[PDB]
């Protein structure tokens, strides 16, 4: 039987959570995690210390900031105490935190500039602003580049505009395809 896949995710390049579905094993087994980097100065693989436990079994591991080297190959090995080795690019796994401090500036009557403060370098992040109207129930999407300023030139004061933004580590510093969690929507 194949070992469960490890789904590593870096969060704002602060900590990495790696998880696997150990429930698929018929016999509950505490699967061990050994991780390292290719072409590193240390030839000794690192054993997981901050283990995550779910259903009284090892569900994953957590790595701190000084263990996260983007732009280097991260090799993860799930070992059965039969091994599963995954070669990963953490640059394509960084999930940023949601944009913070959303604020709308009324530059003009028809112009609305949405601005948000992100908890990571703005250049590495491409944002996706979804705005919704009382009639336009479908969340209209407009991708915004590293410059975090979304200027809608056609707005209606009568319309109750709702805005929500999700960042992504894309494309300048990495090619991550995992969008961040939606921020708290702001109404106008």
């Amino acid at each position, epitope marked *: 039987l194949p070992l469960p896949e490890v789904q590593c995710f870096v969060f704002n390049v602060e900590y990495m959570n790696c998880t696997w579905n150990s429930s698929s094993e018929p016999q509950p087994t505490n699967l061990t995690l050994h991780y390292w980097y290719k072409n590193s*100065d240390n030839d000794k693989v690192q054993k997981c210390s901050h283990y995550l436990f779910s259903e009284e079994i090892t569900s994953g591991c957590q790595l701190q900031k*000084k263990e996260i*080297h983007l732009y280097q190959t991260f090799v993860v090995q799930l070992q059965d105490p039969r091994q599963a080795t995954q070669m990963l690019k953490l640059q394509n796994l960084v999930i940023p935190w949601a944009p913070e401090n959303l604020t709308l500036h009324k530059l003009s009557e028809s112009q609305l500039e949405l601005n948000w403060n992100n908890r990571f370098l703005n250049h590495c992040l491409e944002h996706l602003v979804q705005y919704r109207t009382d009639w336009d129930h479908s969340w209209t999407e407009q991708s915004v580049d590293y410059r975090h300023k979304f200027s809608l030139p056609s707005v209606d004061g009568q319309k109750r505009y709702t805005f929500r933004v999700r960042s992504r580590f894309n494309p300048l510093c990495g090619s991550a395809q995992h969008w961040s969690e939606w921020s708290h929507p702001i109404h106008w």
Partner: antibody
Amino acid sequence: VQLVQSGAEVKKPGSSVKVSCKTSGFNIEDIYLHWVRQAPGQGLEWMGRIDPANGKSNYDPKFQGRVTITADTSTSTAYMELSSLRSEDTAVYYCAALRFFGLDYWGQGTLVTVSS
Amino acid sequence: EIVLTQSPATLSLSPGERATLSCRATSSVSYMYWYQQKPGQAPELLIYRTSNLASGIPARFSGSGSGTDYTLTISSLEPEDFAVYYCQQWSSNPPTFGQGTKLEIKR
């Protein structure tokens, strides 16, 4: 994840000083522990290294006869013992750790002041 | 030992400028590592393997070089950038540091 070293020691010439470095947040035997001293108002000076898993130690030729670096994996703590202390040995001794690339982690440094 | 010479001994620049620090080795080394020591604190790795930034290091820092000649570049200087920088080698035993370049504030 920290390296905690012992307190500052005032020693007399001709004695020995044992500096300890206890590691938390990872396994001692999973890293390479280097010892680097810095004299007051001087640059960094590498003293030695140890692979705690195997117990093998490599010493800088300057201290090859005088320094001894050992490790205890049970307590996850390494020791650097410098004998035949001289006033030229007054320095801040750091324990650094190689985990992935370079000297990732550094100890806060133990000041050893050698004076009669 | 591969003696590393770091120039200048002191580099006085105002904040906002670009700083270049040079390490020259007596013999060729595979990589260069850069450490930042603030006064009263332990050294902190910035650059590993001659170009790669350590964890938590801002993008202002850059590294380049080959053979004997290596350079650390700071595109923009900031108040927290004025410290002592040390170039280190691991190619030949024993590991060797540079004597340090104190980055100074130029008034």
